[PDB]
């Protein structure tokens, strides 16, 4: 009596994000937008569980990221059961530490954030 090997990745966001009890002073990198606003995918996302006001730090770097963006972000193509800091670069499923298979080979896409 199972299902749902992984589950869902509205799940895996929190897992690795620890929802704050208020936005810090941080700034979302992906929507470059003041955490105390809303999300930027806002209105792309319309997922109900997540929101966009709503956010969290995460548990290695401890950077601050709308939940939701980060949920935009893993599902627009990287849904492998894992999250990825677009900021500092940093793996929580795959691998947490070293980059991923080393010197990972950007063909098409490339993100270009410092
Ligand atoms: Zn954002
Ligand atoms: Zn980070």
Redesign the pocket.
């Known amino acids: 009596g199972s299902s749902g090997s992984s589950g869902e990745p509205e799940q895996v966001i929190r897992k690795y994000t620890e929802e704050l009890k208020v936005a810090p002073e941080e700034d979302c990198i992906i929507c470059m937008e003041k955490l105390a606003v809303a999300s930027g995918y806002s209105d792309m996302t319309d997922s109900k569980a997540l929101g966009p006001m709503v956010v969290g730090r ?1 548990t ?4 601050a ?1 709308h939940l939701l963006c980060l949920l935009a972000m893993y599902c627009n193509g990287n849904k492998d059961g894992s999250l990825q ?6 793996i929580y499923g795959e691998k947490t530490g070293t980059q991923p298979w080393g010197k990972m080979e950007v063909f098409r896409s490339g993100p270009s954030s410092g």
């Open positions: 995460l290695k770097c401890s950077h990221f800091c677009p900021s500092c670069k940093t």
